[PDB]
Amino acid sequence: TDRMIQEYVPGKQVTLAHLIANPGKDLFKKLGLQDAVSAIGILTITPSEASIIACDIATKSGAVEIGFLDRFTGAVVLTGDVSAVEYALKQVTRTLGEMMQFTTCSITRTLE
Amino acid sequence: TDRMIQEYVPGKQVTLAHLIANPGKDLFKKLGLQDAVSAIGILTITPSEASIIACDIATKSGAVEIGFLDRFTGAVVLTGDVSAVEYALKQVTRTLGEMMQFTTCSITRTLE
Amino acid sequence: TDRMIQEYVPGKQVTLAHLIANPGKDLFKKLGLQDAVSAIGILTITPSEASIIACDIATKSGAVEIGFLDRFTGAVVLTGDVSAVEYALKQVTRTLGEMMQFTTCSITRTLE
Amino acid sequence: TDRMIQEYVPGKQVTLAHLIANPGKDLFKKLGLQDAVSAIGILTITPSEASIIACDIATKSGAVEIGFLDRFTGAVVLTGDVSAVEYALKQVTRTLGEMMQFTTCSITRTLE
Amino acid sequence: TDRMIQEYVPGKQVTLAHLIANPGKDLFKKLGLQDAVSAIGILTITPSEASIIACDIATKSGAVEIGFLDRFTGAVVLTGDVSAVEYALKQVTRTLGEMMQFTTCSITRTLE
Amino acid sequence: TDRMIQEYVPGKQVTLAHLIANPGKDLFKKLGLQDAVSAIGILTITPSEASIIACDIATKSGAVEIGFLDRFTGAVVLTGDVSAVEYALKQVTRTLGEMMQFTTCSITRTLE
Structure with a gap:
């Protein structure tokens, strides 16, 4: 019933940072x-x-190497030694959040 | 008509988990x-x-095997023994929900 | 002027069920x-x-046969005898709504 | 900045009906x-x-003929006699609006 | 935290009209x-x-000629003499806004 | 769950301007x-x-050169001397913001 106009713009956010x-x-x-298979x-x-x-x-x-970059969806898969990839993910969130005012998530992991 | 700017970001949610x-x-x-056809x-x-x-x-x-993964839409179809796929769906929802603060749905089934 | 962040997630809804x-x-x-041409x-x-x-x-x-399935948009076209397709549409809405908590529309028709 | 989860579903609306x-x-x-070129x-x-x-x-x-149908975007271009296309547009809006609870626009025209 | 269902429909708006x-x-x-290169x-x-x-x-x-039409995104690039293109842009906004109730922007320019 | 119709239109915003x-x-x-690799x-x-x-x-x-333009997503990658690209980014944001009422971000940099 109720109606509104929404002007869309992308937010600034790292939603997932997962090892x-x-x-x-x-x-x-x-x-x-x-x-060779490695940690990812x-x-x-957002924005992409x-x-x-x-x-x-x-x-x-x-x-750490770029496994792939998707500039259309904002997805990035990183590859390398697991602790190096973890360090990278932390640097990405640190830099975007602290220096570019993105909302950032915590680093999450699947180690088993 | 009221007007608002909406900055979009993906939510964190498992919307469907269906056997x-x-x-x-x-x-x-x-x-x-x-x-061969199997349970799926x-x-x-979200995010994809x-x-x-x-x-x-x-x-x-x-x-359980990956039938397919779609990182663009966030769809996953799993294959395997019906009971094993069921356990997998419960583990996906338990893990994303409890460990990563996703909103999760209940597991639903088509057995007939 | 007014500004808000929107975390998007798909809803659970059958918006159209039409014969x-x-x-x-x-x-x-x-x-x-x-x-051969048949009723559809x-x-x-949503979700797709x-x-x-x-x-x-x-x-x-x-x-009833699957005319097409579109897992990207959520569209499905069913084919068969008109009363069978109607029964199918009713079963889809019955099951999604009552057992999976989707919002569902009524079955609508074009018979002429 | 205020924050909200928005579950998306398509609306039911004819936004343009133009001759x-x-x-x-x-x-x-x-x-x-x-x-041959004809009136369109x-x-x-929505939904598409x-x-x-x-x-x-x-x-x-x-x-009236289907020039094209786009089930992904919901676009339809019709072709035929200008008066017949006009009647068709009015029937689309009358039928979706009165019989299926779509929001409908008025029919608009470019005659020059 | 707070949650809402959003039924999406396209708005009616010319957001950019730029020379x-x-x-x-x-x-x-x-x-x-x-x-040959010309003014654009x-x-x-919206809608597209x-x-x-x-x-x-x-x-x-x-x-004025159609440089391109994009019915999927709503983008149009016009070509011709700069004053003719300006007149066209003005006619587009005049007609959509005044006769079809679109929200319209002012004509903006890059002349240097 | 509360429900609302949202008519979508693009906003006017430069969300990222990064060196x-x-x-x-x-x-x-x-x-x-x-x-050859250069500063970017x-x-x-938005709009794209x-x-x-x-x-x-x-x-x-x-x-400064166009590395690429994406009118579908609104992405632009510029190339050239680092100081020239920086000046270009400032001119894009100054011009869209002051002359066309876009919301603009600050210029951000990766120099290391």
């Missing part, structure tokens, strides 16, 4: 990832273009 | 699923990237 | 439907993945 | 329309699947 | 525009199908 | 950018078509 230490080979391949870091970012910035921060933080 | 014990061959095929588990997840995590929790929970 | 007893051949073909049942479902469940309920209800 | 008596050949061609009727419909119903009501109302 | 007298050749080509008129229109109407009004207003 | 002085070669390549400027703009205007303001402001 999987030992993902399955099938999951890894279904994501289109190449190289998974980011959900901030994925570019998260990639730069992450790869500059240590020996 | 179909005996899906028809046509459906199973229209979904692009391969192998159907998940709807959390489908990756749900897949990991599911395949680690027992003898 | 067309005698659709035109041009409409039928433009929808990419095969076989048209569903609009619940289209899979609606298909299963519908095809289990009687001699 | 162009004499569209230019370039436009008619940029729309992918075939046959333009519909915007209701475009199927609008098409049926239109073609059954008289000598 | 660029001398766009760069690289910008012109990246937009996929053909012919840029429209943002109203782009069709804006095109018709614009091309009927004088010697 | 990366030294992006890695892999990122630069994953973005589909050609030529990253814009997020305003990316066209931002491009024009940027290339006219000095020796």
